[PDB]
Design an enzyme around this catalytic site. Sequence first.
Site, PDB file in Angstrom:
ATOM      1  N   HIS A  73       6.102   5.889 -20.191  1.00 46.35           N
ATOM      2  CA  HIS A  73       7.178   5.236 -19.453  1.00 46.35           C
ATOM      3  C   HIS A  73       8.297   5.022 -20.468  1.00 46.35           C
ATOM      4  CE1 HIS A  73       9.555   2.082 -17.486  1.00 46.35           C
ATOM      5  NE2 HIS A  73       9.076   2.563 -16.354  1.00 46.35           N
ATOM      6  N   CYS A  88       0.757  -1.245   0.000  1.00 45.25           N
ATOM      7  CA  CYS A  88       0.000   0.000   0.000  1.00 45.25           C
ATOM      8  C   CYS A  88       0.788   1.296   0.000  1.00 45.25           C
ATOM      9  CB  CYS A  88      -0.949   0.004   1.198  1.00 45.25           C
ATOM     10  SG  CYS A  88      -1.569  -1.641   1.665  1.00 45.25           S
ATOM     11  N   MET A 137       4.079  -5.713  -9.733  1.00 47.96           N
ATOM     12  CA  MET A 137       4.724  -6.144 -10.966  1.00 47.96           C
ATOM     13  C   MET A 137       4.670  -7.659 -11.155  1.00 47.96           C
ATOM     14  SD  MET A 137       5.624  -3.435 -12.576  1.00 47.96           S
ATOM     15  CE  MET A 137       7.064  -3.549 -13.697  1.00 47.96           C
ATOM     16  N   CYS A 168       1.503   3.643  -3.224  1.00 48.91           N
ATOM     17  CA  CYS A 168       0.499   4.619  -3.639  1.00 48.91           C
ATOM     18  C   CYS A 168       0.063   5.596  -2.552  1.00 48.91           C
ATOM     19  CB  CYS A 168      -0.737   3.902  -4.166  1.00 48.91           C
ATOM     20  SG  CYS A 168      -0.442   2.893  -5.650  1.00 48.91           S
ATOM     21  N   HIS A 169       0.029   5.140  -1.305  1.00 48.31           N
ATOM     22  CA  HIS A 169      -0.435   5.982  -0.207  1.00 48.31           C
ATOM     23  C   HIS A 169       0.647   6.595   0.672  1.00 48.31           C
ATOM     24  CE1 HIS A 169      -4.669   5.052  -1.046  1.00 48.31           C
ATOM     25  NE2 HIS A 169      -4.365   3.773  -1.168  1.00 48.31           N
ATOM     26  N   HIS A 226       9.349  10.601 -13.055  1.00 45.70           N
ATOM     27  CA  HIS A 226       9.905   9.287 -12.831  1.00 45.70           C
ATOM     28  C   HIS A 226      11.190   9.076 -13.614  1.00 45.70           C
ATOM     29  CE1 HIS A 226      10.060   5.252 -11.384  1.00 45.70           C
ATOM     30  NE2 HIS A 226      10.034   4.745 -12.601  1.00 45.70           N
TER      31      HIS A 226
HETATM   32  C1  DHE Z   1      13.212   5.073  -9.914  1.00 49.34           C
HETATM   33  C2  DHE Z   1      13.286   3.947 -10.903  1.00 49.34           C
HETATM   34  C3  DHE Z   1      14.028   3.874 -12.070  1.00 49.34           C
HETATM   35  C4  DHE Z   1      15.001   4.900 -12.621  1.00 49.34           C
HETATM   36  C5  DHE Z   1      16.398   4.459 -12.542  1.00 49.34           C
HETATM   37  C6  DHE Z   1      17.482   5.451 -12.651  1.00 49.34           C
HETATM   38  O1  DHE Z   1      17.303   6.494 -13.316  1.00 49.34           O
HETATM   39  O2  DHE Z   1      18.557   5.208 -12.071  1.00 49.34           O
HETATM   40  C7  DHE Z   1      13.766   2.600 -12.666  1.00 49.34           C
HETATM   41  C8  DHE Z   1      14.315   2.083 -13.837  1.00 49.34           C
HETATM   42  C9  DHE Z   1      14.304   0.786 -14.315  1.00 49.34           C
HETATM   43  C10 DHE Z   1      15.028   0.246 -15.422  1.00 49.34           C
HETATM   44  C11 DHE Z   1      15.908   1.026 -16.313  1.00 49.34           C
HETATM   45  C12 DHE Z   1      16.075   0.867 -17.582  1.00 49.34           C
HETATM   46  C13 DHE Z   1      16.854   1.735 -18.461  1.00 49.34           C
HETATM   47  O3  DHE Z   1      17.083   1.357 -19.630  1.00 49.34           O
HETATM   48  O4  DHE Z   1      17.266   2.817 -18.009  1.00 49.34           O
HETATM   49  C14 DHE Z   1      14.778  -1.109 -15.456  1.00 49.34           C
HETATM   50  C15 DHE Z   1      15.378  -2.144 -16.358  1.00 49.34           C
HETATM   51  C16 DHE Z   1      13.840  -1.404 -14.409  1.00 49.34           C
HETATM   52  C17 DHE Z   1      13.310  -2.646 -14.072  1.00 49.34           C
HETATM   53  C18 DHE Z   1      12.233  -2.909 -13.273  1.00 49.34           C
HETATM   54  N1  DHE Z   1      11.667  -2.016 -12.411  1.00 49.34           N
HETATM   55 FE1  DHE Z   1      12.259  -0.048 -12.120  1.00 49.34          FE
HETATM   56  N2  DHE Z   1      10.985   0.093 -10.473  1.00 49.34           N
HETATM   57  C19 DHE Z   1      10.954   1.172  -9.630  1.00 49.34           C
HETATM   58  C20 DHE Z   1      11.717   2.318  -9.709  1.00 49.34           C
HETATM   59  C21 DHE Z   1      12.569   2.707 -10.762  1.00 49.34           C
HETATM   60  N3  DHE Z   1      12.847   1.930 -11.868  1.00 49.34           N
HETATM   61  C22 DHE Z   1       9.925   0.927  -8.570  1.00 49.34           C
HETATM   62  O5  DHE Z   1       9.743   1.571  -7.562  1.00 49.34           O
HETATM   63  C23 DHE Z   1       9.129  -0.290  -8.996  1.00 49.34           C
HETATM   64  C24 DHE Z   1       7.801   0.262  -9.685  1.00 49.34           C
HETATM   65  C25 DHE Z   1       8.761  -1.203  -7.881  1.00 49.34           C
HETATM   66  C26 DHE Z   1       9.794  -1.426  -6.862  1.00 49.34           C
HETATM   67  O6  DHE Z   1       9.450  -1.470  -5.651  1.00 49.34           O
HETATM   68  O7  DHE Z   1      10.979  -1.574  -7.236  1.00 49.34           O
HETATM   69  C27 DHE Z   1      10.057  -0.836 -10.091  1.00 49.34           C
HETATM   70  C28 DHE Z   1       9.959  -2.080 -10.643  1.00 49.34           C
HETATM   71  C29 DHE Z   1      10.679  -2.621 -11.674  1.00 49.34           C
HETATM   72  C30 DHE Z   1      10.486  -4.008 -12.142  1.00 49.34           C
HETATM   73  O8  DHE Z   1       9.664  -4.801 -11.729  1.00 49.34           O
HETATM   74  C31 DHE Z   1      11.512  -4.252 -13.242  1.00 49.34           C
HETATM   75  C32 DHE Z   1      10.693  -4.434 -14.611  1.00 49.34           C
HETATM   76  C33 DHE Z   1      12.375  -5.429 -12.996  1.00 49.34           C
HETATM   77  C34 DHE Z   1      13.287  -5.283 -11.844  1.00 49.34           C
HETATM   78  O9  DHE Z   1      14.498  -5.566 -11.983  1.00 49.34           O
HETATM   79  O10 DHE Z   1      12.822  -4.886 -10.759  1.00 49.34           O
HETATM   80  N4  DHE Z   1      13.550  -0.229 -13.753  1.00 49.34           N
HETATM   81  C1  HEM Z   2      -2.935  -1.931   0.519  1.00 52.38           C
HETATM   82  C2  HEM Z   2      -3.650  -3.239   0.840  1.00 52.38           C
HETATM   83  C3  HEM Z   2      -3.881  -0.733   0.390  1.00 52.38           C
HETATM   84  C4  HEM Z   2      -4.674  -0.211   1.361  1.00 52.38           C
HETATM   85  C5  HEM Z   2      -4.777  -0.679   2.803  1.00 52.38           C
HETATM   86  C6  HEM Z   2      -5.380   0.892   0.759  1.00 52.38           C
HETATM   87  C7  HEM Z   2      -6.413   1.573   1.378  1.00 52.38           C
HETATM   88  C8  HEM Z   2      -7.211   2.500   0.760  1.00 52.38           C
HETATM   89  C9  HEM Z   2      -8.415   3.072   1.369  1.00 52.38           C
HETATM   90  C10 HEM Z   2      -8.978   2.748   2.756  1.00 52.38           C
HETATM   91  C11 HEM Z   2      -8.948   3.884   0.442  1.00 52.38           C
HETATM   92  C12 HEM Z   2     -10.248   4.669   0.550  1.00 52.38           C
HETATM   93  C13 HEM Z   2      -9.941   6.022   1.181  1.00 52.38           C
HETATM   94  C14 HEM Z   2     -11.121   6.982   1.160  1.00 52.38           C
HETATM   95  O1  HEM Z   2     -12.217   6.610   0.694  1.00 52.38           O
HETATM   96  O2  HEM Z   2     -10.945   8.126   1.616  1.00 52.38           O
HETATM   97  C15 HEM Z   2      -8.088   3.812  -0.738  1.00 52.38           C
HETATM   98  C16 HEM Z   2      -8.302   4.516  -1.901  1.00 52.38           C
HETATM   99  C17 HEM Z   2      -7.514   4.451  -3.024  1.00 52.38           C
HETATM  100  N1  HEM Z   2      -6.351   3.708  -3.118  1.00 52.38           N
HETATM  101 FE1  HEM Z   2      -5.655   2.402  -1.837  1.00 52.38          FE
HETATM  102  N2  HEM Z   2      -5.016   1.076  -0.572  1.00 52.38           N
HETATM  103  C18 HEM Z   2      -4.063   0.084  -0.792  1.00 52.38           C
HETATM  104  C19 HEM Z   2      -3.325  -0.045  -1.973  1.00 52.38           C
HETATM  105  C20 HEM Z   2      -3.421   0.808  -3.072  1.00 52.38           C
HETATM  106  C21 HEM Z   2      -2.496   0.793  -4.213  1.00 52.38           C
HETATM  107  C22 HEM Z   2      -1.446  -0.267  -4.493  1.00 52.38           C
HETATM  108  C23 HEM Z   2      -2.823   1.862  -4.989  1.00 52.38           C
HETATM  109  C24 HEM Z   2      -2.090   2.437  -6.212  1.00 52.38           C
HETATM  110  C25 HEM Z   2      -1.976   1.581  -7.477  1.00 52.38           C
HETATM  111  C26 HEM Z   2      -3.990   2.480  -4.362  1.00 52.38           C
HETATM  112  C27 HEM Z   2      -4.703   3.513  -4.935  1.00 52.38           C
HETATM  113  C28 HEM Z   2      -5.831   4.076  -4.366  1.00 52.38           C
HETATM  114  C29 HEM Z   2      -6.696   5.028  -5.054  1.00 52.38           C
HETATM  115  C30 HEM Z   2      -6.487   5.630  -6.435  1.00 52.38           C
HETATM  116  C31 HEM Z   2      -7.740   5.249  -4.221  1.00 52.38           C
HETATM  117  C32 HEM Z   2      -8.954   6.146  -4.470  1.00 52.38           C
HETATM  118  C33 HEM Z   2      -8.823   7.587  -4.005  1.00 52.38           C
HETATM  119  C34 HEM Z   2      -7.774   8.350  -4.778  1.00 52.38           C
HETATM  120  O3  HEM Z   2      -6.681   8.570  -4.224  1.00 52.38           O
HETATM  121  O4  HEM Z   2      -8.045   8.721  -5.940  1.00 52.38           O
HETATM  122  N3  HEM Z   2      -4.314   1.873  -3.158  1.00 52.38           N
HETATM  123  N4  HEM Z   2      -7.039   2.937  -0.547  1.00 52.38           N
END
Ligand code: DHE
Ligand code: HEM
Lengths: 551, 559
Positions: free
Chosen positions: B380, B57, B98, B60-61, B337
């Site tokens: 992206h 969570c 992912m 996103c939050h 990003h």
């Molecule tokens: C901030 C960031 C960058 C920029 C790098 C830089 O400029 O130094 C980046 C780039 C990347 C790049 C850069 C590619 C390039 O050509 O520059 C790759 C291969 C990549 C593979 C993945 N990324 Fe990435 N990635 C994240 C964050 C980032 N990824 C996340 O937070 C996320 C969404 C989930 C997490 O918790 O990590 C995430 C998941 C992934 C994957 O699941 C991938 C597909 C496989 C893996 O190894 O985790 N990310």
């Molecule tokens: C992880 C299991 C998780 C929790 C816990 C969580 C809670 C949560 C609540 C209780 C709400 C409703 C809040 C309200 O009505 O005021 C809520 C809403 C949204 N969430 Fe969430 N959420 C969890 C996970 C995630 C993840 C992984 C994402 C992002 C991909 C996500 C996103 C959102 C969104 C969008 C909403 C709706 C409101 C908004 O921000 O637009 N949540 N979540």
Amino acid sequence: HKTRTDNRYEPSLDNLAQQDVAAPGAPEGVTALSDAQYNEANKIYFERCAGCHGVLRKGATGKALTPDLTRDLGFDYLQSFITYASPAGMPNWGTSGELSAEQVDLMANYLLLDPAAPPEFGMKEMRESWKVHVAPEDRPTQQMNDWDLENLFSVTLRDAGQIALIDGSTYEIKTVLDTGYAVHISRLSASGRYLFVIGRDGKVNMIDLWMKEPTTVAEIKIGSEARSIETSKMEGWEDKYAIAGAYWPPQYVIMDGETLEPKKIQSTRGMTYDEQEYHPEPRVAAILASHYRPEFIVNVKETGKILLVDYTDLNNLKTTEISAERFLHDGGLDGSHRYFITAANARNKLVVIDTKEGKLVAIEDTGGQTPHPGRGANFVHPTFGPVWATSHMGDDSVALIGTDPEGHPDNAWKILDSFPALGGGSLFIKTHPNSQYLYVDATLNPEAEISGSVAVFDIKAMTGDGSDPEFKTLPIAEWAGITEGQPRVVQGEFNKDGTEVWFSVWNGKDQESALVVVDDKTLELKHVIKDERLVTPTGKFNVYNTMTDTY
Amino acid sequence: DPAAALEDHKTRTDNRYEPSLDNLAQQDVAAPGAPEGVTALSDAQYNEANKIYFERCAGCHGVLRKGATGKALTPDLTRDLGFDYLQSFITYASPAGMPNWGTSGELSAEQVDLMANYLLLDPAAPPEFGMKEMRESWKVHVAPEDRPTQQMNDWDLENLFSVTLRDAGQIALIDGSTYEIKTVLDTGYAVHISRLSASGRYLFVIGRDGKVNMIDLWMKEPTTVAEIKIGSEARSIETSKMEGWEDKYAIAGAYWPPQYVIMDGETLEPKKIQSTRGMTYDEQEYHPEPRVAAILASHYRPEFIVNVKETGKILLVDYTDLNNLKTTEISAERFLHDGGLDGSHRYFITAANARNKLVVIDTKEGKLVAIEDTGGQTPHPGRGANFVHPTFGPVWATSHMGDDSVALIGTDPEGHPDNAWKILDSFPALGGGSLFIKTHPNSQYLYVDATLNPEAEISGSVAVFDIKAMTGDGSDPEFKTLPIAEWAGITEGQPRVVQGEFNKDGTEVWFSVWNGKDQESALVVVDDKTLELKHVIKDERLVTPTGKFNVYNTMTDTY
Ligand code: DHE
Ligand code: HEM
Ligand code: DHE
Ligand code: HEM
């Protein structure tokens, strides 16, 4: 925890203390406090402890008091320690530091609970408080009153939430304007047309001195606790911007110099310069304006960083974050207006920054305890050449530092002399180019006789031979003729011509106060200003000397 | 209405890429007290809920629950909603992470209750990580003085590929011409990216857990010569690339704590730590958790280019003086990003993904030059793809996670003024869920994957456009579909194809055929001139191959 002459100058967050807080739940082994018990303890904490320990309790001049640390100490230890009380605040309005048995319990329990962070205060909040009373298009295009604006003095009537605009030659109070509560300082735009005042609660009022009846043309709130404000002083940028600094939230805000519209808010939360550790409450202290570049000079206290903020582009913001020394507070520019000299007070150091090159030049120990220069005093020492002076809150010493690397290289940025004045508790040192005298107060001294007097050194007679220069003692409070209390004399401020110096004879709100004007040439009493409206006079700022940074 | 979760928390092709703070989730936390009107959770229960929160969570939050792409879930807000609402809403699940390693987003009845209760309690901020902590973790295995003065192995270093073997926390150094896995190195936990020093001698890798390893490619047997931890969650790293500053510094960015750290380029000694906590650019409201995303290095000035996500600020940090630190904080767009420099290496083009915008910064002048909507959903680019379009002139391209579009932006303000920083064309590739687009100066082809597409046929294939055939007629250019996964001959699971990366000569392009950690993966090498299969790299050690970085193309920013 006892009252020292140099530990009463800690921030009393009494405005933030007025906010109601919710009582947190207590983890196993800790007893919770009711909403009222918690609020009562929170109010006491913000008013008497937060200054040294921080609202978040992460530590400032005093160590951190976070739950993890306090719980290890235990309730019994805390209770016994807190029983002795805490350091008293500033005189006349500050706390006594005394706590009852009931309060000692509340405080001990409070420190064991997890504190919430007070609310933030951003753009939405600022814009809601932003009010333009007189739009620029509706203001005059030339001065419409007959006052001598450059010789005016803007005087803080602290507890009344007002300021008095006083004629510098006739001593007539031209007007008393309301602002709300306790204005900390007055600052003028570079043109001298606009007067800016910042209240301790973060309220900023902008006054147009050109109006037939000067009044607040715009106002805005920039935080919950604030102490500093300044205007753009680079040639070509006159009246363009104003900047305000806050204790809480830890931030500074750049506003439009004509409307006060908030343009750029910058958080000061960050890393300490030395131990490079995150600090969640780096308070903004003094803010000055560069005369060499279009930049604001911002002191960030707890992290020991001096920021040079370039205001030529607020979207692509250029800043220079200078690692200096922790506990930066006040300071001033040297006579050439090129070097910023500031006190890292708790560490007894003077930090020097070159505003032209944008870099740290030197850090030197004054040999005294807790230097507090205000903006300091620049003068040409007969032997040493150009120097800047500061007195101290912790002792009676006055320290001089060389400020001329080109003409006096061997003396530059070195403490050249240190000598005693009246006693400890000094807050402001003052001089002016047209004067041959160096004035030093002793506001916080515990002895009434001393706190009501001022020491005056004859610069012309200074030899720098190592002996202690003699000083004449002016019985300022006595000259004011005040019967009740032990009024404290504070802050010398010169008129535009640098021929007369004013001092505030600061007494309580329900007591008699006065302003004393001294003839600089003779060191004799010139005039005593008393008026029923002159309630708790503190800071005084001459329009010309403030707009030009003449000190 | 809790039924709103059906849409808010539905898994989409473009909402699976939010951070999973599984490293921070490992830390055990004490249960806070519960105020009146709130039921407390035991230490065990709270820890269990905390782990789930950080893993599923917090992306996103927010860790602090102050909101990121999703809204804030602080106690003041959740308590007004009440336990019943939270319990019902969370019952519908949450967006999946992912593929292969991410969460399913499904929770048991017991877990749903733990989460609802957890949200009603006051969260403590995770521990900070400063200079003391970094120095305690700092280890120099081989002092600079003891390293070789010349390359001691016979490898063609510039044609080497550093490949992330994700789940295993290893990297494979693979020969670009023989395809031989020269060595597999362990770093502990998942490496996110590999970056090269400007000289091409030092290989830097950043672990998702904040661990930085520096590898000396000149050793007879290259290994880590220095390591340091810079935070609890990190995803980016870069080296100094300004002429005259080769090998001088390295910089790492962290999600938690929100900060970036400049380290000595030869020993990893931590030199300057900067907090990213601050104000959002537009609403100018304090945000306590601004994550550092991509970090690039200027070729025009001795500066690092740092993307600060939640606040929408791009920082240009001057490393010529770390004591009197000069920075330019550029107001851009929220949710910055990834991104890359244009062909001339002067302009930084980056995606503010959640807002479908491309932000352009002039690194020479140090200022924002443009912000344009791509017309697509969730761009992206990775570092993007630069090429001279036959009719439009120099352009940079990006594909999208939310749709099948590929957008081209002009990158030549002096030579093609009217076309500069304008979306010149937008056309479909394979389908939605794309992650990387790629080309090379020696190739006439533009490659686009579709990694997160829900359809196996698409996710296991790549679209290839012939740049030479591109006209400016507004119609959609055709593309050839390469069945990459099929070419790899993998039976079990639905492996996903991801990220093209060229060899030094730009004559061959590699793709990862990414399968689960207990399944078979592979690397597929395509002959760029013929668009035919060249070689398939398979090995029991090749576990979860993802990011691939060619030494030359990475050290020179050739893309
Ligand atoms: C901030 C960031 C960058 C920029 C790098 C830089 O400029 O130094 C980046 C780039 C990347 C790049 C850069 C590619 C390039 O050509 O520059 C790759 C291969 C990549 C593979 C993945 N990324 Fe990435 N990635 C994240 C964050 C980032 N990824 C996340 O937070 C996320 C969404 C989930 C997490 O918790 O990590 C995430 C998941 C992934 C994957 O699941 C991938 C597909 C496989 C893996 O190894 O985790 N990310
Ligand atoms: C992880 C299991 C998780 C929790 C816990 C969580 C809670 C949560 C609540 C209780 C709400 C409703 C809040 C309200 O009505 O005021 C809520 C809403 C949204 N969430 Fe969430 N959420 C969890 C996970 C995630 C993840 C992984 C994402 C992002 C991909 C996500 C996103 C959102 C969104 C969008 C909403 C709706 C409101 C908004 O921000 O637009 N949540 N979540
Ligand atoms: C940060 C700061 C500045 C620099 C302003 C600038 O550069 O614009 C300053 C300056 C000042 C200056 C500037 C003088 C000058 O010549 O520049 C004055 C007059 C002044 C009168 C007081 N100050 Fe001040 N002051 C504080 C903070 C500060 N004081 C505190 O935190 C403290 C210790 C306690 C508090 O909670 O306010 C405090 C108490 C006081 C007083 O009690 C004084 C004597 C009376 C009053 O009106 O409150 N402070
Ligand atoms: C206000 C009523 C107030 C409280 C409460 C408070 C508490 C407190 C405790 C419990 C300690 C013990 C810490 C330990 O680990 O032993 C402590 C210590 C110090 N304090 Fe304090 N304190 C209150 C107020 C103030 C004020 C106004 C100041 C600053 C002038 C101050 C300072 C200090 C200092 C110094 C210490 C000693 C240890 C150190 O930090 O060097 N306190 N306080």
